[PDB]
Design a protein around this ligand. Structure first.
Ligand SMILES: C[S@@+](CC[C@H](N)C(=O)[O-])C[C@H]1O[C@@H](n2cnc3c(N)ncnc32)[C@H](O)[C@@H]1O
Ligand SMILES: C[S@@+](CC[C@H](N)C(=O)[O-])C[C@H]1O[C@@H](n2cnc3c(N)ncnc32)[C@H](O)[C@@H]1O
Ligand SMILES: [Ca+2]
Ligand SMILES: [Ca+2]
Lengths: 351, 336
């Protein structure tokens, strides 16, 4: 696990490098603008001032990321990771800078009022299926064990625990784990924090102000879980952490199964660790994460093939809805938006 | 000259399509065969389906070869050029297939309606109205404009597009004679395995059905270099085009220059700046608000402005993931 230590400080270092990276991007824009003919520059007399506002938004974002860094460096479970790693002050990769940008957007989806419409489209259908299958009239929710793999910043798992179910989120990415630890443990005052999740988008802006607008978080107090709640989060590969068979009443995957190198392996795990009679609720598209990465296994299945594999495992299909429309960390003011026609299904492991 | 080097570079890319795509399928096949036998047995049609993909690749390569030959050793083309090739196949859906009609109706019909409103027969002899369509892609919009009787010229920079528009516009008459498989490179977000290999047919109309006395033409080259004669055009119609500029202010300058006094510029599209993420390329990314302020300072008069014109671009209607654009539509007039 010396390589996990190496990976830990690599991610810490990426968090610390955000401002350097983004300030370079803005300096390229200023350089290019300053090389235009003077008369064209005079057509845009607020352009340089707007770059200054972007730079302030960058500094603010960097301040949020250093707060997360400060939080996770001083966590007891992270003492096994060491002093400061190498004596390396190293630049971070662009691949990690892209993950940082996505992580900032994830705050919108999971912990901002701005993301409520997205959560209503993705999380509420899952929560409703849970209420349908484990209704309060017949089930003590505190004895129903629900696992949420790839929980991201944890809002879905948290919402399930708010209803009283014994809910565990699981997440492999340090970007998400550092950030959700910060939100779930430290952000105990509604909308106290702010970030600028769209400053990286220079294209498709209707108004220049849209790029620098803030989002506030958290929209709920994460510590309003009532007494008797049972909420937890685990760190690691879903496929390695969960080895006990016949354990879970429910597994809820939301925009997750297409993260697999091999989705058949996910299906195999979910079958093994569900209790007889347990259910797997899935909602999401099929954007295979490793498809366009060299030296990475990626088995890309159509939804039709996924359902055929699920049926051959012995699962029984109880709910299937195609074309469940949603966005994912959408920028509502952008002139370009991605939409997903997700499939929702509920399948049961036979008793 | 180095333009003939660039020419043969694109010819070679057309000829490398099958090689590049068969290698992609090889990686999927190798990875599937790497799986444990018990997992491969769950999917007894998987390898046969790759074989259908390979047939569709071969059929696409035949089409590309008739395009290249009806335009007149194989070296590895760049990943950058194969992506442009894949996009060109998709462009056939948008411009010359019935599949693309809903897209054309959302993007092309608003432009044509503004042309009809601004050059009505009660005022204009249409055959003397000169309309320019920069970045005409495969030519459908410019062709529709010429079908109304106006003197319309399309202009296109990309050899991928020019080779293909030449094939469609000059060697196609029989409706739906040809088919392509524009979706075979999409392995993600498929509802049904059959959706990846489904065909589209083109052309949905006969391009040689232009009326008598028509005036339709296409030029090859950089819009900003080819059009130097001032005060020439009655109308310039830009559709998903102005975000292709290194510096959109230069496009605005050219449009101002070559419009006649009283002529109009019709624009519809988003602002996805082509060079934003390309290393060592100039890219001035303006908000729409800033583009409007440049247009106002040039002296254009704003006659029409609609934001949030909703459209897709070479959408795969069966895909589980789709891109939507909230386009701006405007019509501005160079004062008389
Ligand atoms: C597209 S995000 C979805 C996040 C969240 N479920 C939501 O809908 O907002 C998928 C998440 O799964 C995580 N992930 C991918 N593979 C994983 C694995 N093998 N084990 C645990 N988490 C994984 C990624 O880090 C990412 O946070
Ligand atoms: C996004 S496509 C739009 C095609 C077509 N107008 C449509 O709406 O379907 C933009 C087109 O402009 C072309 N283009 C980019 N820069 C150009 C230039 N400077 N001169 C001429 N064409 C250009 C590209 O090759 C491409 O075909
Ligand atoms: Ca300054
Ligand atoms: Ca509190």
């Amino acid at each position: 696990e010396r390589l996990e230590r190496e990976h830990f400080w690599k991610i810490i270092n990426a968090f610390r490098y955000y401002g350097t990276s983004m300030h370079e991007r803005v300096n390229r824009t200023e350089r290019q603008f300053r090389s235009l003919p003077a008369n064209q520059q005079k057509l845009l007399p607020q352009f340089l001032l707007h770059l200054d506002k972007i730079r302030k938004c960058i500094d603010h974002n960097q301040e949020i990321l250093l707060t997360i860094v400060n939080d996770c460096i001083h966590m007891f479970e992270n003492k096994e990771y060491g002093e400061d790693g190498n004596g390396k002050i190293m630049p971070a990769s662009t691949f990690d800078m892209d993950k940082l940008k996505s992580t900032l957007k994830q705050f919108v989806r999971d912990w901002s009022e701005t993301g409520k419409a997205e959560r209503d489209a993705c999380y509420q259908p899952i929560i409703k299926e849970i209420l349908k299958n484990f209704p309060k009239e017949r089930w003590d929710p505190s004895k129903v064990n629900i696992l949420v793999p790839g929980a991201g910043l944890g809002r879905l798992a948290w919402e399930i625990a708010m209803l009283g179910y014994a809910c565990q989120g699981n997440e492999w990415s340090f970007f998400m784990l550092f950030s959700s630890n910060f939100v779930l443990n430290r952000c105990s005052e509604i909308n106290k924090y702010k970030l600028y999740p769209w400053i990286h988008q220079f294209s498709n802006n209707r108004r220049s102000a849209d790029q620098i607008r803030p989002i506030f978080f958290p929209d709920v107090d994460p510590h309003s879980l009532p007494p008797g709640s049972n909420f937890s989060m685990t760190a690691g590969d879903f496929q390695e952490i969960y080895s006990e068979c016949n354990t879970w009443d429910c597994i809820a995957t939301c925009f997750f199964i297409d993260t697999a190198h091999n989705v058949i392996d996910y299906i195999d795990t979910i079958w093994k660790i569900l209790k007889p009679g347990g259910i797997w609720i899935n909602l999401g598209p099929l954007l295979y994460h490793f498809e366009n990465l060299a030296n990475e296994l990626s088995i890309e299945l159509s939804y039709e093939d996924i359902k055929n594999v699920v049926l051959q495992y012995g699962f029984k299909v109880e709910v299937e809805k195609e074309s469940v429309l949603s966005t994912y960390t959408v920028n509502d003011l952008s002139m370009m938006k991605y939409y997903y026609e997700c499939v929702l299904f509920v399948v049961r492991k036979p008793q």
